[PDB]
Amino acid sequence: GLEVDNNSLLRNIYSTIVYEYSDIVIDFKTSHNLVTKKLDVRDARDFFINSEMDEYAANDFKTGDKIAVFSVPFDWNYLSKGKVTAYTYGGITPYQKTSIPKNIPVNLWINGKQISVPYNEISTNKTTVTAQEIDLKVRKFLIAQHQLYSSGSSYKSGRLVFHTNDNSDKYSFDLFYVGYRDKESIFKVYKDNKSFNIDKIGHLDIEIDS
Ligand SMILES: [K+]
Ligand SMILES: [Zn+2]
Incomplete structure (x- = not known):
């Protein structure tokens, strides 16, 4: 171009827009995806984030882990009532209690x-x-x-x-x-x-x- x-x-x-959340639990973990539990409410819908990442990187996480999120979305799904899922890539780090x-x-x-x-x-x-x-x-x-x-x-x-x-x-x-x-x-x-x-x-x- x-x-x-x-x-x-x-x-x-x-x-x-960028998504930044410091404390959320992984609701589901699959070979190359992590889906968080409810993050908050955006436009009346409960907000969730799906993170796509290389299987090698996903191996670092398991359902239930506490994590932090800092990522930019490339897609959104509104096909589920009162719910909205943003799709992102990586951007996941282990939960950190005290900010430095x-x-x-x-x-x-x-x-x-x-x-x-x-x-x-x-x-x-x-x-x-x-x-x-x-x-x-x-x-x-x-x-x-x-x-x-x-x-x-x-x-x-x-x-x-x-x-x-x-x-x-x-x-x-x-x-x-x-x-x-x-x-x-x-x-x-x-x-x-x-x-x-x-x-x-x-x-x-x-x-x-x-
Ligand atoms: K690169
Ligand atoms: Zn240098």
């Missing part, structure tokens, strides 16, 4: 030039945080402050790299991945339920280029 079209696409895709707010340093380069990013721009209260949560916070920031996906923007490529301080290769997201041009494919990059120990993330390295 063309630059202008990819921008409009991603701008709309990442404008999608921590800022994650960010290094940003736009078209080769380094740009300062405030100390408190990206943060999380989790000791085990998903790459998805960080990505969502990063893109919201970039869209609001650095013209990411904006109309009239010349950007065409970019990446968010998690520069961890361990022996693992650096995990990253492609900021201009468009898949099949819909939420189902674009958000599918979160299916691995990738997460990090907060003390292992040294900082984030972001590149955006035209």
Whole structure:
């Protein structure tokens, strides 16, 4: 697709509302899905979240486990009376009683030039945080402050790299991945339920280029 079209696409895709719940129990766990118990009430209907993830990642959970959710939906189901289920990818971490707010340093380069990013721009209260949560916070920031996906923007490529301080290769997201041009494919990059120990993330390295 063309630059202008990819921008409009991603701008709309990442404008999608994010779901954040710190304490919920898994009602059902299957090979590659987790379904929460009632989260709350949205538009008069009882709200539930279904998380799709690689079987390898799902192996980490069992029915009854207490978990936290931070994810973006790609579909909704209203076929059941007084009920609504949002479908998402990963975004699941073990329940954490006490919040531990921590800022994650960010290094940003736009078209080769380094740009300062405030100390408190990206943060999380989790000791085990998903790459998805960080990505969502990063893109919201970039869209609001650095013209990411904006109309009239010349950007065409970019990446968010998690520069961890361990022996693992650096995990990253492609900021201009468009898949099949819909939420189902674009958000599918979160299916691995990738997460990090907060003390292992040294900082984030972001590149955006035209
Ligand atoms: K990726
Ligand atoms: Zn780095």
